[PDB]
Each structure stands twice: as C-alpha cells, then as structure tokens.
Design a protein around this ligand. Structure first.
Ligand code: CLA
Ligand code: CLA
Ligand code: CLA
Ligand code: CLA
Ligand SMILES: C=Cc1c(C)c2cc3nc(c4c5[nH]c(cc6nc(cc1[nH]2)C(C)=C6CC)c(C)c5C(=O)[C@@H]4C(=O)OC)[C@@H](CCC(=O)OC/C=C(\C)CCC[C@H](C)CCC[C@H](C)CCCC(C)C)[C@@H]3C
Ligand SMILES: CC(C)=CCC/C(C)=C/CC/C(C)=C/CC/C(C)=C/CC/C(C)=C/CC/C(C)=C\CC/C(C)=C/CC/C(C)=C/CC/C(C)=C/CC1=CC(=O)C(C)=C(C)C1=O
Ligand SMILES: CCCCCCCCCCCCCCCCCC(=O)OC[C@H](CO[C@@H]1O[C@H](CO)[C@H](O)[C@H](O)[C@H]1O)OC(=O)CCCCCCCCCCCCCCCCC
Ligand SMILES: CCCCCCCCCCCCCCCCCC(=O)OC[C@H](CO[C@@H]1O[C@H](CO)[C@H](O)[C@H](O)[C@H]1O)OC(=O)CCCCCCCCCCCCCCCCC
Ligand SMILES: CCCCCCCCCCCCCCCC(=O)OC[C@H](CO[C@@H]1O[C@H](CS(=O)(=O)O)[C@@H](O)[C@H](O)[C@H]1O)OC(=O)CCCCCCCCCCCCCCC
Ligand code: HEC
Ligand SMILES: CC1=C(/C=C/C(C)=C/C=C/C(C)=C/C=C/C=C(C)/C=C/C=C(C)/C=C/C2=C(C)CCCC2(C)C)C(C)(C)CCC1
Ligand code: OEY
Ligand SMILES: [Cl-]
Ligand SMILES: [Cl-]
Lengths: 51, 30, 36, 334, 244, 137, 97, 32, 33
C-alpha cells in the first residue's frame, strides 16, 4: 500500500476536525508526518481479529 | 517576520518619496 | 544568454545614439537667452 | 514640425516636473537597473564567494542578515578585473555565486551618477544659471569612483572594492587602515578637516543667519512664516550678524560680503573631499600613509615607542586576521 | 594542432582534455619484459550527480543532476604514474603526482550548494587479468583517497579550527558548550573513492588513449559539522603511455 | 643606556678571540646592511625564506658556524646552505657572484666586516625584535 | 567522543621532540647539520616504525649517518596523523614568521 | 533567526505612535 | 502560560488602528467649528 494512500485514511487530514482559533498549518498540530507506521491488527487472546 | 518588517518600512519610505515630490505643497510667489 | 547579449547590445546602442544625436541637434541654441 | 524635433523639445523641456535632458536619457535607465538589481539582491540574493576561496559570504536579508549586516557582496577574487555580465555565465546560479550583481550595480551606477553630474550642468544651462553646481558634486562622485573603481584597479580585483552594505563598509575601512595607514595620510587628514569644518561652518552660517532674523512674526507662530517665497528683500540682517561675529573673534575674521561668504562655504568641504578622494585613489597604487615605525631610538639603539608604534600594533592585528583563509604566502602584496 | 597559450587563453579550452580521432581505434601492445608509465592522464568531468536524501519513510534515493557554479575549474590533468604489468597479466596504474584534485561546488534544486573535492589522489587502478594489449574494450577500476575538503589550518567564520583557531564559541562566554561541541571540534576526514575508466579510442602508434570515466566519492562534511552527500561524477579522460 | 665598547665587542673567530668596534664602524655596517641586505633581511628576518633568520643563535648552529665576523665575511664571499653542503652564490648575493648581484661589485673587505659587526651587534641591542618579525614590531 | 586530534598529539612525544613522521621540515633547523639536505631525505622517506630506521636511508654518507646518530636523541616517531601530513603541510604548514 | 520577539511590537509602536500623532495634527490643520 | 505570541501584536493593532481612525476624524471635526 503506498503511504500517500494510507495518509488519506487518517482523521487528522479530515477538514472537519479543526477549530476557529487553532491557527496555522496542519503541521502545527499533529506535527510533520514522517512515515507510515504500518497497519495495526488487534487480536484478543482467542486470536479473533479486533477492530 | 524580521525580514518582512524591514521591507515594509523601506517600502513606506519609497511611497513617502512619491507623495513628497508629486503631492507637495506647491511653492508660489507673492 | 545569446539572446540577452544581443538585446542588451541593441538597447545600449539605441540609447547611446539618442544621446549623441540629441547633442548634435544644435544644443547650444537650446537656452533661454540667446540663439547664437 | 518633424517628429525628431518634437522629441528633442520634450527631452530638453524645462516644463517637465523632473528634467530629462540628454544626460537624462542615459542616467534614467542605468540608475533604474542599478536600483532594481540592488533592492532585489539585498533582500534575496544567495551567498557570494568574495575572496575566490570557496567560502561564501551571506549578504542578504533572507539568508539571515539585518539592515545593518546586509550587503550586496563584491565579486569573486577569481574574477579579478574581468568583465562579468550575466551573458558570460553558464547560468544565473553561477552568476549569483561569483558576485555578478555587484558588477551590474556599480557599473550602471557609476555611469548614471556621472550623468547626474552632467544633468546638473544641463538644467543650469536651460535656466540661464551659472554652471558650477556640477563641480561641487564632482567631489562626492569622485569619492564613489575611488572606492568602487579606482581602488579595485590598483589592487587587481573588484573583490577589494567597497561592499554595498553598512557593515561591509566598515570591513572596507579597517582593512584599508591596516594596508595603507590611511589615518596617517595627509589627504585623509584633509578630508576630515573637510567634513569637520564643513559641519562647523554649516552650524555657524545656520546659527548666524537664524540669530539675526528680522522680527516679522509674534511668539505664537513659527518665525519661518516671516519669509515669503520669492520676496524681494532679505530676511536677516547681515550687518547685524557681522557685528556679532566680528566681536566674537575680531572684525576682519568675519565676512561682510555675502558672495565671498557663500563661496567659502562651497569651497571648504568640496576641496577637502577632493583631497580624500584623491587619497583613496593614490593609495590605490600603494603610496601609503606616513610610517614612523621605530622612528625614535636611544643612545644604545633601543626602540622608544611613540603613539605611531601603538597605531602599528592595532594595524598589525587587523593585518593578520583579515581574510584569514586567503593568504598562502607571507606578504599580502595586493 | 600545436596551438599556443595565446591561442587558447580565455576560451575554456584549457579545461578540456585532448581527444583522439574517431578513426583511432587500434591497440597498444603490452610487453611483460617492459616497464611502462602514464606520462599524462587527463580527467574532464561533464556531469555531477548527487544522491538526494530520501525521507524517514524512504523508498529509494536517486542521483539528482546538479548545476556547476564554480566555472571551468574542474579538470584533473598532468597526472603521472607507472604502469606495472602484473603476473596474472593485468596492468596497474599507481598515481604518483599531477594536479589530481579540484574543489568543485554544484547546486541542487532548491538552492542547496554541495562542495566536494573532485579527486583521484593515490589512485590505484587495475585491469582484468591477462591483458596482452590495451584495446577499445579495456577497463580499469580503481580506488583513490579523498582527504578533507579543507585542510587543518582552515578557520571558520568564528575563528575556530583544527591546527589553529579558537577552541570554543567565544561570542557566548557562559553558554553550555555541550550542545556546540560538534562545531567547536574540527575533525579531518579521509575517505575512499572508486573510479572506472573505459578505453574507447586507441592510437597504438603514439600510445594515446581516450575514453569515459565514472567515479563515486563523498562531498565536503565541513570538518565534521554535518554529514556529507554521496556524489557520482562522469566525464572523459585522455592518457599518454610511454615506455619507461 | 648607550653604545659602549662592551656592546661593540663580538666574536672575531670561533676560536673565542674577539674584536672591538667603534661607533663609526657599527654605523657604517648599518648603512651598508641597508644598502645591500635589508631588501630581504630587514629586522633580522629573511623575506624570501622566513625559516632562516639572522639571530646569533641561528648563525651559531649553521655549518660552518657564522656567529663570528670571519665566518660571516666568508659567507658573504661564498655562501652555503645551512648545512654547508651546497654553494648558493648563484642565488645569494656574494663577492663570488658580484657579476649578477651588482650591489656587491664595489664592496671592500673592510665594508664586509662592518656588515658582520652590525649583524652581530644588533641583537645585543634589540634582543628578540631582531629576527622576530611582526610579533615584535 | 569528539576530540581535537592535533591537541592530543601535543600530549605525546610529538610535543617534546621532532616527530620524524609528522613534524614540519623547518623544525629540523633546531639542530646543527640537518637542514636542508637530510631534512629533505628524512621526510621524502618519511614513514618510519622506530626512530633508528632513519639510519638505513639509502644513500647516507658516513658523515651523514654520524650526524643522525648525534641527533637520534632529538627524534621520536608517533603515528602518522593525516591532519599534519596532508596538503603537503610537512613542507609548508602556513607558519612563516 | 533566533531574534527578540518583542522587537516586532517595539518596532510597530515606534512607527505607529509618533506617526499617528503627526497625521492627527496635519488633518485638523487642513480643515480650518 | 504558553500563549500565542502574536496574540499581543494582534490585540494591540486591533485596538490602535480603528481607535486612531476615529480620533483623527473627531479632531478635524472640532477644528471646523
Ligand atoms: C479568504 C481569505 C483567506 C483564507 C481563507 C486564508 C487561509 C489561510 N491562510 Mg492566509 N491570509 C489572508 C487571507 C486568507 N488566508 C490575507 C488577506 C492575509 C493577509 C492579512 C493572509 C496572511 C496569511 C499569513 C501570514 C499566514 C496565512 C495562513 C493561512 C492558513 C491558516 C489561517 C489561520 O490560522 O486562520 C486563522 C483565522 C482566524 C483566527 C479567524 C479570524 C477572524 C476574526 C476572528 C473575525 C473578526 C471579527 C470581528 C471583529 C467581529 C465584529 C463585528 C461587529 C462589531 C459588527 C490558511 C490556509 C498561515 C499559514 O499557515 O501559511 C503558511 C500564515 O502564517 N495567511
Ligand atoms: C542607457 C542605457 C544603458 C546603458 C548605457 C547600459 C550600460 C551597461 N549595461 Mg545595461 N541595461 C540597460 C540599459 C543600459 N545599460 C537596460 C535598460 C537594461 C535592461 C534591458 C540593461 C541590462 C543589462 C544587463 C542585463 C547587463 C547590462 C550590462 C551593462 C554594461 C555593458 C553592456 C555591454 O556590453 O554593452 C555593449 C554595448 C556596445 C558594444 C555598444 C557600443 C555602441 C556602438 C555605438 C554600437 C555598437 C553596435 C552593436 C554591436 C550592434 C548590436 C547588434 C550586434 C551584436 C548584432 C554597461 C554598464 C552588463 C553588465 O553590467 O555587466 C556586468 C549586464 O550584464 N545591462
Ligand atoms: C580636543 C579637541 C580637538 C582639537 C583641537 C582637534 C584638532 C584637530 N584635529 Mg582632532 N579630534 C578630536 C579632538 C580634537 N581635534 C576628537 C575628539 C576626535 C575624535 C576622537 C578627533 C578626530 C580627528 C581626526 C580623525 C582627525 C583630526 C584632525 C584634526 C585637525 C583638523 C581639525 C579640523 O579641521 O577641525 C575643523 C575646524 C576648523 C576648520 C576651524 C579651525 C580649527 C583650527 C584647528 C584652530 C586654529 C588654531 C589657531 C590658528 C591658533 C590661534 C589663532 C589666534 C592667534 C588668532 C586639528 C589639529 C585631522 C588631522 O590629524 O589633521 C592633521 C584628522 O585627520 N581630529
Ligand atoms: C572621527 C573620525 C573620522 C572622520 C571624521 C572621518 C572622515 C572621513 N573618512 Mg575616514 N576613517 C576613519 C575615521 C574618520 N574618518 C577611521 C578610524 C578609519 C580606519 C578604520 C577610516 C578609513 C577610511 C577609508 C578607507 C575611507 C574613509 C573616508 C572618509 C571620508 C568619508 C566621507 C566621504 O567619503 O564623503 C564623500 C561622499 C560620498 C562617498 C558620497 C557619494 C554620493 C553618491 C555619488 C550619491 C549616492 C546616491 C545614493 C546611492 C542614492 C540616494 C538617493 C536617495 C535620496 C533616494 C571623510 C573625509 C573615505 C574617503 O576618503 O572616501 C574617498 C574612505 O573611503 N576613511
Ligand atoms: C556618505 C555620504 C554621502 C552620501 C550618501 C551623499 C548622497 C547624496 N549627495 C547628493 C548630492 C550632493 N552631495 C554634495 C556634497 C557632499 N555630499 C557628501 C556626502 C554624501 N552625499 C559630502 C561629505 C559633501 C560635501 C562635499 C553635493 C554638492 C551634492 C549634490 O549636488 C547632490 C544633490 O543632488 O543634492 C541633493 C545626492 C546625489 C543624488 C544622486 O546621485 O541621485 C542619482 C542616484 C539615484 C537617484 C539612485 C541611486 C540608486 C543606486 C543604484 C543605489 C545602489 C547603489 C549604492 C551605491 C549602494 C549604497 C549602499 C550603502 C550602504 C553603501 C545624494 C542624496
Ligand atoms: C588672569 C587674568 C589676566 C584674567 C583677566 C582676563 C583679561 C581681561 C585679559 C586681558 C586681555 C587678554 C585677552 C589677554 C591676552 C590673552 C589672549 C591673547 C588669549 C589667548 C586665547 C586664544 C589663543 C584663543 C585662540 C583663538 C581662537 C579660539 C581661534 C581663532 C582662529 C580663527 C580666526 C578661526 C575662525 C576662522 C573663521 C573666520 C571662520 C569663519 C566662519 C564662518 C564661515 C561662519 C559663517 C558666517 C560668517 C560671517 O561672518 C557671517 C556674517 C555670516 C552670516 C555667517 O554665516
Ligand atoms: C489594518 C492593520 C491591523 C490589522 C491587524 C489587526 C489585528 C487583527 C487580528 C485578527 C487576526 C487574529 C489572528 C490571531 C492568531 C494569530 O496571531 O496567529 C497567526 C496566524 C498564523 O499562524 C502562525 O503560523 C505559524 C507558521 O506559519 C505557526 O503555525 C504559528 O504557531 C501560528 O500561530 O495568522 C494567520 O494565519 C493569519 C491569516 C488569517 C486570515 C484568513 C482567515 C479568514 C477567515 C474568514 C474571516 C472572515 C470573518 C468575517 C467576520 C466579520
Ligand atoms: C508607548 C509608546 C511605545 C513606544 C515604542 C515602544 C518601543 C520603544 C523602544 C523599546 C525599547 C527597546 C527595547 C527593545 C525591545 C525589547 O524587547 O526590550 C525588552 C526589555 C524587557 O526585557 C525583557 O525582559 C523580560 C523579563 O522581564 C525577558 O527577559 C525578555 O527576554 C526581555 O526582552 O524592555 C525593557 O527592558 C524596558 C525598557 C526600559 C529601559 C530604561 C533604561 C534605558 C534608559 C535609556 C533612556 C535614554 C534615552 C536616550 C534617547 C535620547
Ligand atoms: C612661498 C610659496 C610660494 C607662494 C605660494 C602662495 C600661494 C597663494 C595662493 C592664493 C590662492 C588664491 C586666493 C584665493 C582665490 C580668491 O581670491 O577667491 C575669491 C574670493 C575673493 O574675496 C573677496 O574679494 C573681493 C574683491 S575681489 O573679487 O577679489 O577682487 C571682495 O569683494 C570680498 O570682500 C573678498 O572677500 O575669495 C573669498 O571670498 C575669500 C575666501 C577665499 C578662500 C580661499 C580660496 C579657497 C579656499 C579653499 C580651502 C581648501 C581647504 C580644504 C580643507 C581641508
Ligand atoms: C634576497 C634577494 C636576499 C638578499 C638581498 C640577501 N639575502 Fe641573505 N639570505 C637570503 C636567503 C634566501 C637566505 C637563505 C639561503 C639558504 O638557502 O640557506 C639567506 C641567508 C643568509 C644568511 C645565513 C643565515 C643563517 O641562519 O644561516 C646570511 C648570513 C645572509 N643571508 C646574509 C646576507 C647579507 C649580509 C646580505 C647583504 C649583503 C644578504 N644576505 C642579502 C636572501 C637574501
Ligand atoms: C525609453 C526612453 C526613456 C525611458 C526609459 C526607461 C524608463 C528605461 C527603463 C529601464 C529599466 C526599468 C531597467 C531595469 C533594469 C533591470 C535589471 C537589469 C534588473 C536585473 C536584476 C537581476 C539580474 C536580478 C537577479 C536576481 C538577484 C539579484 C537575486 C535573487 C535572484 C535574481 C536572479 C532574480 C527616457 C525617458 C529615459 C528617454 C529616452 C526614451
Ligand atoms: O587586504 Mn589584504 O590585501 Ca587588499 O587583498 Mn591582499 O588581502 Mn585581500 O581580498 Mn580583500 O584584502
Ligand atoms: Cl576581512
Ligand atoms: Cl597568498
């Protein structure tokens, strides 16, 4: 999966998550994106996949 | 912000030059 | 750069001649007092 | 009449808000090209390898300078006195690195300023004036030629011309004292006398005319409104100013002729500043200021230091630090 | 032809290596019972590529082309060295002297300037084995030393250096020296380069050969104040072989 | 302080023998040193080779030794490298080479000694300054 | 972790003696008979392992080998320090007067 | 560059405040 | 408190610029009368 696509699938780039007096660029908030970490898979102790 | 401040003040001086020359109190002879 | 060189040569050349011919056009007569 | 004649009569019109003239025709484009290049380089130009040693100096605002440290930096020593138009470079990027704007700015400027001088002659001709204002301006024009043109010629490099900046100018002054003992040159001592005396005589004439203004106003209004532009009469009493000043010193140390007085005001700074421009121009050919280093010695022959030996110790500190990576050999001969 | 200084001066041809005629593609016989020498080796770069820095996610760094800003000052010439004939038959050039270095500064997109010491100091280049004659398919592959771009007396703008200079940031008397140490302390690097030369033109008569080169070396690190870039250089070379 | 004969006493030879000078000789030797020598050797240094000064301690350690008038007159006649190995009259002014160093054609043997005496007397006056260079100006 | 390699040498025998592998050729002026002839050889041949390998230089005269013996007490050898020997700084290190 | 960030407000009022004074005095002159 | 630094210049200008405009127009009003 290209990182450019996974970066779209993250709510920090959702325009509806901002604030009227939280000024400046998006980078001023969560920081400067450096690297996709990987897709997280959660399993309980029974090995069911959790979401 | 420091570069901006310097260029802004210099720009106002040049604008001043223009009104000082072309919009002076014109001199007259009595 | 070739195009700039030519265009600067020509500009300068033009201006130079306005200066020369302008003064060759009877400059001593252009004054408020006497036309020689 | 014919179009060439409409044009000539416009160029030389004494009706234009600003006079053009034939000198005007060269002055205008060249000063514009210098002004626009200078402004853009001062804000934005990238660093410049002044001394030819691949050690670039940052002169512009955007590369971390302020109004006081900023400069357009002189062109590379590797270029020496070669002509370096933009069209001699492989790219703007190469031209910026090696100092090209400096050449563009100073050449267009020396030229436009020289024509400034002629334009002052020209307008004075069209107005029916005497012509020698332009001669007074030759003193500052001469001075600019010296630090931008003559001194680089004698030394072999435009890199040793005066930078276009506040701190660069000081750099230039200190290096010159170390290499030429300019303080100990009489022509510079003449220039100081030129400018100290100029300022002195400025304050005097100002204070003396102002001291003797004729009461034509009340205390609630500027005394300036006592002068009406183009009034037939004089607004101060020169006889009264003379009687004050002749007493301050003695009668004949004082001017009672206005024409003789004003010619004195023109000539004093102009002369002295001719000398100091001649000063920079002759030290351009390493005819340096007086050298009294170890000039006093005792019966045995110990050196007895004078204040000139103390000057030389400072000079020496400037010597050994300036352009600290650029000398490979023991003598700094240019 | 036999030109003269006055013919060449100020044209840029002084920074150009000689060339052989398109028709010069013979072969130089090599003679084990003989000893050889390169009497002149000339290297003239034509392009400078610098590996971009791929971000923390990376993917792969490419070599990006650059702009030369230091003018026609880049060529290695008058390089000499002997040409041994080895026992497996290969030939080895061992640089002895010459003008074997040029400081060059190229510029990257966005205005980064990258100085480097373009060099082949101590070059040692050998052919494949069993080479009885240099032909237009002969390759050398070599390695050279790349010393620090500045040498030990160089002073930085605040007067600090290795063999000379202030040893601390004297403008900041009571700053904590801990965070400035990498700039207070001048380190002198010496790394290694690698170069292939590919003979494409031979004049078996005269002993003249010509071809192309590619080398890879590091750029200036400014006596340890920052990391260097990886540089790839490509260009052409001339060489003259004489019996010794 | 003053120019006394105890200052104007310098090694004649390396035998330890000595000779005393006058005000007139020492001053002639300063004049002639200026005329023929100081273009390169001003203040006891050597502009075309800073590594060799004229300090008595340097001269002492040359082969042959030169901290006496004799070995100096000899060097002005037939200069050698610091180690005695090469003759260098071809590039260093000497009587041996006064056809290409014309300032040397009219120098008498009495003039040569005046120059040596000067060179050996001047550091007793100036100490470190002589041969020190600009640090000491 | 970060140290000025030149200052460090000054703590070794390079600081007391003529380091035959590192020191500039003008320090050989300190002793009688060494400069310029034997200085040029010592340096030409320079990388030695022990101070006494200097006597094995090909070509010494018998007076030369003697002068070297007379001044072996004035030499040492330390590790070749790149920063001291590159740039041809052994022949000219930028110090004049 | 690590500059004084009260320098902006200082420069700003340095300009504005005396500048405002003079404009006020000029306009009420023109209107009498 | 870790507060927006341009808050100060913003508040200072937000007041000074409109306030000065009003004063200019009041004072040249009084001088007419
Ligand atoms: C439609 C106009 C417009 C838009 C949409 C943007 C949008 C943007 N600009 Mg740009 N900008 C604009 C005009 C605009 N700008 C203009 C005209 C200027 C010159 C003044 C600038 C100067 C500028 C700079 C210098 C910077 C931006 C930056 C930005 C970004 C962040 C802005 C932010 O924090 O908002 C903040 C918005 C607010 C806090 C809202 C202000 C509205 C006030 C509170 C309302 C006033 C109410 C009034 C007094 C009520 C009384 C009425 C009653 C009495 C009658 C964003 C992409 C920034 C960036 O990230 O660039 C890299 C940045 O640094 N802009
Ligand atoms: C009054 C107008 C004027 C004058 C006097 C100058 C003067 C100068 N300019 Mg400037 N310049 C000007 C206007 C002017 N400029 C304007 C308006 C622009 C914007 C287009 C520029 C842009 C400009 C650039 C971009 C550069 C200069 C440069 C220069 C310098 C030399 C240029 C040169 O080689 O001329 C050569 C001129 C001649 C040989 C003419 C001689 C006159 C005879 C009588 C005519 C010769 C016939 C000619 C060869 C025919 C032309 C075509 C032919 C080649 C096919 C000089 C200081 C260069 C510089 O400063 O380098 C550091 C440089 O890089 N100028
Ligand atoms: C204590 C005060 C003092 C005095 C008297 C002087 C006087 C002088 N200085 Mg100095 N100077 C001073 C302080 C002073 N300086 C300070 C504080 C600085 C800055 C640190 C300098 C920096 C300075 C520089 C850098 C230089 C001088 C130079 C000079 C000479 C030219 C000055 C000149 O033309 O002035 C302008 C004044 C006039 C034109 C009016 C006339 C003034 C003269 C000197 C008085 C005449 C005396 C009169 C004939 C005797 C009595 C007459 C009576 C019988 C009728 C003059 C000898 C220059 C120099 O060395 O020249 C050799 C020079 O290069 N000065
Ligand atoms: C009290 C101490 C003192 C004093 C009074 C002076 C006085 C002087 N010094 Mg000395 N100097 C001093 C100490 C001092 N100095 C020291 C300590 C040093 C050693 C560090 C020196 C080293 C030194 C050097 C190396 C130089 C001087 C020069 C000068 C002269 C400078 C003024 C000048 O050149 O006008 C002349 C006028 C001009 C240069 C003006 C040019 C005007 C142009 C033509 C117009 C420009 C137009 C502009 C760009 C656009 C404006 C338009 C705008 C309105 C929109 C003057 C005689 C300079 C000199 O003699 O110059 C020749 C010089 O180069 N000094
Ligand atoms: C540092 C000192 C100094 C400066 C800056 C200066 C400046 C000026 N003097 C002028 C005049 C004079 N000055 C006079 C006597 C004197 N002038 C003196 C000292 C100075 N005079 C002294 C000491 C004297 C006594 C002798 C006289 C007698 C005159 C005049 O007649 C003349 C004038 O008109 O009176 C008002 C003006 C010429 C206008 C012009 O050329 O427009 C043309 C140039 C223009 C419009 C724009 C130039 C743009 C250029 C390209 C800018 C970039 C290049 C610069 C060189 C960069 C400088 C950077 C600095 C940091 C170094 C100008 C305002
Ligand atoms: C203990 C005791 C005895 C106490 C008692 C005191 C007592 C009463 C004393 C007895 C008398 C007495 C004086 C005793 C002798 C002592 C004595 C000789 C004092 C020595 C003091 C001394 C040497 C002073 C030095 C002189 C001095 C300060 C300088 C003079 C040099 C000089 C002439 C320079 C100026 C040059 C010059 C003329 C400048 C012109 C300036 C000018 C261009 C200005 C513009 C201008 C000029 C005009 O002209 C008018 C018109 C107008 C318009 C105008 O713009
Ligand atoms: C006339 C001259 C005087 C005018 C200025 C008067 C002051 C007015 C102040 C109003 C701005 C207040 C902003 C405070 C925040 C600030 O200082 O941060 C300063 C922020 C910039 O943000 C800074 O950015 C930096 C990196 O660029 C870092 O992120 C900093 O941390 C961050 O603070 O300013 C803005 O970005 C300015 C532009 C805002 C304009 C667009 C908004 C349009 C919204 C529509 C509004 C219409 C509403 C109409 C209602 C009627
Ligand atoms: C109202 C009108 C406003 C006028 C314009 C206001 C600006 C005027 C100039 C401001 C002063 C310049 C200071 C730079 C700004 C700065 O940050 O300062 C900032 C400093 C304050 O300093 C701050 O201190 C803080 C901790 O308290 C933090 O440490 C900050 O880092 C530090 O900046 O301002 C002052 O110190 C106040 C100035 C008082 C000076 C009085 C002594 C000087 C007397 C000189 C009078 C001589 C007059 C000669 C003239 C003729
Ligand atoms: C032993 C060596 C060999 C000998 C060497 C001798 C050299 C002497 C040279 C003499 C110089 C010529 C005299 C001056 C020219 C002339 O007279 O001016 C014309 C007028 C006439 O005077 C005015 O004269 C008028 C009458 S008339 O016009 O002169 O006829 C009268 O109306 C008025 O009152 C009166 O003020 O002079 C003046 O008005 C008086 C001020 C004169 C200033 C002197 C000249 C310029 C000074 C420059 C100083 C530069 C210093 C730089 C500073 C660093
Ligand atoms: C430059 C052209 C010189 C002139 C003129 C004079 N000397 Fe010189 N001197 C010069 C050099 C380059 C050297 C070193 C030569 C070398 O390779 O050894 C010297 C050396 C001497 C010495 C020896 C000093 C020492 O430490 O051993 C002496 C005594 C000396 N020179 C004397 C001397 C005199 C008396 C001169 C005037 C008559 C004179 N030199 C001129 C360069 C130049
Ligand atoms: C026609 C006429 C006239 C007029 C004219 C004119 C008006 C002119 C103009 C002119 C002009 C107007 C000119 C200008 C010029 C310009 C220039 C020449 C500039 C340049 C610049 C540059 C080169 C830049 C660069 C840079 C830098 C510096 C930095 C950063 C980057 C860059 C690259 C951008 C008159 C009236 C006289 C009369 C006759 C006729
Ligand atoms: O003074 Mn010292 O001397 Ca006339 O050059 Mn030689 O050094 Mn350098 O570049 Mn500007 O400066
Ligand atoms: Cl400097
Ligand atoms: Cl040099």
């Amino acid at each position: 999966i290209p990182e450019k696509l996974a970066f779209y699938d993250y709510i920090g780039n959702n325009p509806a998550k901002g604030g009227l007096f939280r000024t400046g660029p998006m980078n001023k908030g969560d920081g400067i994106a450096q690297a996709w970490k990987g897709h997280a898979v959660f399993r309980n102790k029974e090995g069911e996949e959790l979401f | 912000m420091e570069t901006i401040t310097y260029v802004f003040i210099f720009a106002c001086i040049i604008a001043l030059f223009f009104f000082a020359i072309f919009f002076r109190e014109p001199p007259r002879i009595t | 750069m070739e195009t700039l060189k030519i265009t600067v040569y020509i500009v300068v050349t033009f201006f130079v001649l306005l200066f020369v011919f302008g003064f060759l056009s009877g400059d001593p007569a252009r004054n408020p007092k006497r036309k020689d | 009449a014919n179009l060439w004649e409409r044009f000539c009569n416009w160029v030389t019109s004494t009706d234009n808000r600003l006079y053009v003239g034939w000198f005007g025709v060269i002055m205008i484009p060249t000063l514009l090209a210098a002004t626009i290049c200078f402004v853009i380089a001062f804000i934005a130009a990238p660093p410049v390898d002044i001394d030819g040693i691949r050690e670039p100096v940052s002169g512009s605002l955007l590369y971390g300078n302020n109004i006081i440290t900023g400069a357009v930096v002189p062109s590379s020593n590797a270029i020496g006195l070669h002509f370096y138009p933009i069209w001699e470079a492989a790219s703007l990027d190469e031209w910026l690195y090696n100092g090209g704007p400096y050449q563009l700015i100073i050449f267009h400027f020396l030229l436009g300023a020289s024509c400034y001088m002629g334009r002052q002659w020209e307008l004075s001709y069209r107005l029916g004036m005497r012509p020698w204002i332009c001669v007074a301006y030759s003193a500052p024009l001469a001075s600019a030629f010296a630090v931008f043109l003559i001194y680089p010629i004698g030394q072999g490099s435009f890199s040793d011309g005066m930078p276009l900046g506040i701190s660069g100018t000081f750099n230039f002054m200190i290096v010159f004292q170390a290499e030429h003992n300019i303080l100990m040159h009489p022509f510079h001592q003449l220039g100081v006398a030129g400018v100290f005396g100029g300022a002195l005589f400025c304050a005097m004439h100002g204070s003396l005319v102002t001291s003797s203004l004729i009461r034509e106003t009340t205390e609630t209004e500027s005394a300036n409104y006592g002068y009406k532009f183009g009034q037939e009469e004089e607004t101060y009493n020169i006889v009264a100013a003379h009687g004050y000043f002749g007493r301050l010193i003695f009668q004949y140390a004082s001017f009672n002729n206005s024409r003789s007085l004003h010619f004195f005001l023109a000539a004093w700074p102009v002369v002295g500043v001719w000398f100091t421009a001649l000063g920079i121009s002759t030290m351009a050919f390493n005819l340096n200021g007086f050298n009294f280093n170890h000039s006093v010695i005792d019966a045995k022959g110990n050196v007895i230091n004078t204040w000139a030996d103390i000057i030389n110790r400072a000079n020496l500190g400037m010597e050994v630090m300036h352009e600290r990576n650029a000398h490979n050999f023991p003598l700094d001969l240019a | 032809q036999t030109l003269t200084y006055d013919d060449i001066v100020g044209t840029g041809l002084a920074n150009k290596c000689p060339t052989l005629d398109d028709t010069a593609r013979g072969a130089y016989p090599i003679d084990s019972s003989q000893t050889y020498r390169i009497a002149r080796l000339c290297l003239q770069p034509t392009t400078f590529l610098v590996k971009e820095e791929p971000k923390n996610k990376r993917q792969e760094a490419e070599f990006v082309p650059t702009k030369l800003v230091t003018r026609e000052t880049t060529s290695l010439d008058q390089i000499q060295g002997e040409l041994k004939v080895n026992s497996d038959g290969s030939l080895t050039f061992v640089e002895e002297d010459g003008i074997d270095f040029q400081p060059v500064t190229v510029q990257m997109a966005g205005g980064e300037r990258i100085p480097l010491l373009f060099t082949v100091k101590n070059l040692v280049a050998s052919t494949q084995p069993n080479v009885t004659s240099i032909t237009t398919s002969t390759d050398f592959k070599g390695e050279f030393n790349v010393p620090s771009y500045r040498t030990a007396n160089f002073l930085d703008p605040k007067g600090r250096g290795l063999a000379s200079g202030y040893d601390s940031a004297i403008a900041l008397p009571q700053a904590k020296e801990e965070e400035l140490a990498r700039a207070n302390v001048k380190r002198f690097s010496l790394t290694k380069g690698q170069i292939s030369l590919n003979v494409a033109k031979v004049d078996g008569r005269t002993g003249e050969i010509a071809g192309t080169f590619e080398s890879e070396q590091l750029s200036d690190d400014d006596m340890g104040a920052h990391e260097p870039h990886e540089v790839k250089i490509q260009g052409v070379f001339y060489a003259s072989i004489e019996p010794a | 302080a003053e120019l006394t004969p105890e200052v104007l006493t310098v090694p004649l030879n390396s035998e330890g023998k000595t000779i005393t000078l006058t005000e007139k000789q020492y001053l002639e030797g300063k004049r002639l040193f200026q005329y023929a020598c100081a273009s390169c050797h001003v203040g006891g240094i050597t502009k075309t080779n800073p590594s060799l000064d004229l300090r008595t301690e340097t001269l002492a350690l040359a082969t042959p030794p030169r901290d006496n008038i004799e070995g100096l007159v000899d060097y002005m006649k037939n200069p050698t490298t610091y180690d005695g190995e090469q003759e260098i009259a071809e590039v260093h002014p000497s009587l041996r080479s006064a056809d290409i160093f014309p300032k040397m054609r009219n120098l008498t043997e009495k003039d040569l000694v005046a120059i040596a005496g000067h060179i050996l007397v001047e550091p007793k006056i100036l100490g470190d300054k002589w041969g020190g260079g600009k640090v000491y100006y | 972790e970060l140290v000025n390699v030149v200052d460090e040498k000054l703590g070794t025998a390079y600081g007391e003696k003529i380091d035959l592998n590192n020191t500039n050729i003008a320090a050989f002026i300190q002793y009688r008979g060494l400069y310029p002839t034997l200085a040029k050889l010592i340096v030409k041949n320079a990388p030695y392992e022990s101070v006494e390998d200097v006597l094995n230089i090909p070509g010494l005269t018998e007076r030369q080998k003697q002068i070297l013996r007379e001044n072996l007490e004035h030499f040492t050898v330390t590790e070749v320090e790149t920063a001291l020997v590159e740039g041809g700084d052994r022949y000219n290190n930028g110090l004049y007067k | 560059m690590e500059v004084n960030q009260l320098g902006l407000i200082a420069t700003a009022l340095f300009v504005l405040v005396p500048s405002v004074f003079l404009i006020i005095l000029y306009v009420q002159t023109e209107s009498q």
